[PDB]
Amino acid sequence: DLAVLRDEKTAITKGYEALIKRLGTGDNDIPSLIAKKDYLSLYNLPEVKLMAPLIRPNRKGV
Amino acid sequence: WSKADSSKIYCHGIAIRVPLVVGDEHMDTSLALLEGFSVCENDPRAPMVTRQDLIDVGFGQ
């Protein structure tokens, strides 16, 4: 209610928020994976999967 | 060169002639400015850019 931004920037901000909330403790989170050096399991997170539609589609691979 | 005299081509002021005649073959220059773009109706809201950032543009933009 106390906001003036549009759905786009708000969606970006909420995606970042959700991606940060995964910064807690417990496996399946980014800290444990970093400790295990499992840099691959990060690519398969669900949060990146929810923020992907927001990426520029013509250069998302590069 | 310029329209209304398209049958002429200046080279250091030296006017040259075209062996042909055209009234529309030249009127369409929408693709002679940039490589992968096309002119459209004027719109001031659209932001000014350079020739480099063009690579990171999308469609309908």
Structure-block tokens of residue B5: 């005299």
Chain B: closest CA distance from residue A61 (Å): 13
Intra-chain end-to-end CA distance of chain A, in Å: 37
Chain B partners of A58 at a C-beta cutoff of 8 Å? 58-59
Residue recorded with tokens 């920037």: A9
For residues B47 and A35, give the distance between their C-alpha atoms in angstroms, rounded to a whole number: 44
Method by which the model was determined: cryo-EM
Distance of CA A26 to the CA centre of its chain: 17
User: What CA–CA distance (Å, rounded) separates A12 from A9?
Assistant: 5
Q: Which of A47, A44, A51 lies closest to A10 in space, CA to CA?
A: A51
Q: How far is A15 from chain B (nearest CA, A)?
A: 22
Q: What's at A15, amino acid-wise?
A: G
Kindly compute the dihedral angle of the four CA atoms of residues B12, B32, B48, B61, in this order, to the nearest 10 degrees: 180
Which strand (E) or helix (H) includes residue B11?
Answer: strand B8-11
| Residue A30 CB neighbours (<10 A) | 16
- The CA-based angle A38-A43-A48, given to 5 degrees, is 135
For the purposes of burial, counting CB atoms within 10 Å of the CB of A45, is it exposed (0-12), middle (13-18) or buried (19 or more)? middle
State which amino acid sits at residue A35: A
Q: What's the alpha-carbon Rg for chain B, to the nearest Å?
A: 16
Kindly list the residues from chain A whose CB atom is less than 8 angstroms away from the CB atom of residue B59: 58
